[PDB]
């Protein structure tokens, strides 16, 4: 923990000259206001005013005035091995009248956590698994189509010190204070995964944001480009952001049950049932981009159907073999492009709705895999995820449970942003069309 005096003492001792008042918009892009150390005391008094309409993205209509309220527990100093140290503070957005901004994703996640606490659950324990690609750059600094390496699953390809981004990323994260569980080479060439240790939902989302920033910074430092795009290349594996989740009640894992055959309590089963029922509604949030649904194709371990299993090629929900206090429910739809706060909020809200409505868990899918016909698929009651962004947007609009989690203000702006994105995408004429046609016709 930290206090105002502690922050001032550390900043004076560490010779910090630059402070980043970091926050997040609806699209998940990392936003911040730069600050010289001479304004640190003013920042700590919650007296910095900025636009605030930047949260709305490119659909902002008018300039507003909003205040930044830094969270002292998020203070950290970047270890960029240079003089004039740079520090950061993660801030919440407040209206000039003192009320919190309704469109802040962090505030949305906090409100969902509060309504979870109202049910007796003290915290939501979340451990994400972000994957990213490393691309080579040209003389002008732009990413090329060449990967940084040609390693495979769990390979030792980026060895030694030459352009070893994965080692440096883990080292710098550990120096910052990150709790890193493990990291490994991913399935596709040039793909890497770093797994964090488990923490509370707000801290987990802050860690995801900081991790993306650190990965991009260190990759650019080595003459490489890091991307979290869900499907950068056709025919290769995409990047996922599987989120392991478990509810807690005073350091007691309520998802655990020793008497259960699978070690899953009734509360856990209700949670998974609620997540499964509202899957197509949250697809627009956990898979927010157009490219997100190019990843959700069969044959690349990404989930394409709404079903749960303990062992399958690509289930919607997977139950890891770990038990005891580490029993978890792993949701595999989200990609790293998704907003961490919004994705965690919608998943938690769906689980809470399932718990409250005592939903019945559908039977798990056995070793049988999805070569079955569509008639066999809907005969067994196995739904499918939306095929594109428009279907997910329609499902989100028609959904009343997760739209309430988003809130009235944020839902309208998110819908406007995604509709504009889809409208821009759908009218483009791609090179594939010119390759197929323009000679046949």
């Amino acid at each position: 923990s930290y206090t105002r005096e502690d922050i001032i003492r550390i900043a004076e001792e560490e010779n910090v000259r630059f402070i980043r008042l970091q926050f997040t918009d609806l699209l998940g892009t990392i936003k911040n206001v730069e600050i010289p150390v001479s304004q640190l005391e003013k920042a700590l008094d919650n007296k910095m005013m900025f636009d605030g309409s930047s949260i709305e993205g490119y659909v902002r209509i008018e300039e507003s005035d909003m205040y930044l309220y830094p969270d002292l527990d998020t203070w950290v100093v970047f270890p960029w091995v240079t003089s004039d140290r740079v520090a950061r503070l993660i801030c919440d957005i407040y209206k000039p009248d003192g009320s919190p901004f309704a469109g802040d994703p962090r505030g949305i996640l906090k409100r969902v956590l509060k309504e979870a606490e109202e049910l007796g659950y003290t915290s939501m324990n979340v451990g994400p698994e972000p994957e990213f690609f490393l691309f080579k750059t040209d003389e002008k600094g732009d990413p090329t189509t060449e990967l940084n390496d040609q390693g495979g699953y769990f390979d030792l390809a980026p060895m030694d010190l030459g352009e070893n981004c994965r080692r440096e990323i883990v080292l710098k994260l550990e120096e910052m204070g990150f709790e890193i569980e493990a990291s490994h080479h991913e399935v596709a060439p040039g793909q890497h995964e770093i797994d964090f240790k488990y923490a509370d939902a707000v801290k987990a989302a802050d860690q995801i944001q900081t991790f993306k920033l650190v990965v991009k910074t260190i990759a650019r430092q080595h003459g490489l480009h890091a991307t979290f795009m869900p499907k950068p290349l056709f025919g290769v594996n995409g990047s996922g952001m599987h989120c392991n989740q478990s509810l807690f009640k005073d350091n007691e894992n309520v998802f655990y049950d020793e008497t259960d055959e699978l070690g899953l309590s009734q509360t856990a089963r209700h949670y998974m049932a609620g997540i499964l029922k509202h899957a197509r509604a949250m697809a627009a949030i956990t898979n927010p981009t157009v490219n997100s649904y190019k990843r959700l194709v069969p044959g690349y371990e990404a989930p394409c159907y709404v079903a749960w299993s303990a062992s399958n090629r690509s289930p919607m929900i997977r139950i890891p073999a770990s038990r005891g206090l580490s029993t978890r429910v792993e949701v595999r739809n989200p990609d790293p492009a998704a907003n961490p706060y919004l994705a965690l909020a919608v998943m938690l809200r769906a689980g809470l709705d399932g718990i409250k409505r005592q939903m019945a868990l559908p039977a798990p899918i056995d070793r049988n895999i999805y070569v079955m016909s569509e008639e066999e698929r809907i005969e067994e009651g196995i739904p499918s995820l939306p095929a594109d962004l428009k279907e997910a947007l329609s499902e989100l609009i028609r959904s009343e449970v997760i739209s309430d989690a988003l809130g009235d203000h944020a839902l309208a702006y998110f819908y406007e942003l995604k509709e504009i994105e889809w409208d821009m995408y759908r009218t483009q004429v791609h090179q594939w069309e010119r390759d197929q046609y323009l000679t046949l016709y």
Partner: peptide, 10 residues
């Protein structure tokens, strides 16, 4: 079913 792992041949 295994397409993303056989990318070494493509």
């Amino acid at each position: 079913l295994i397409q993303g792992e056989l990318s070494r041949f493509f």
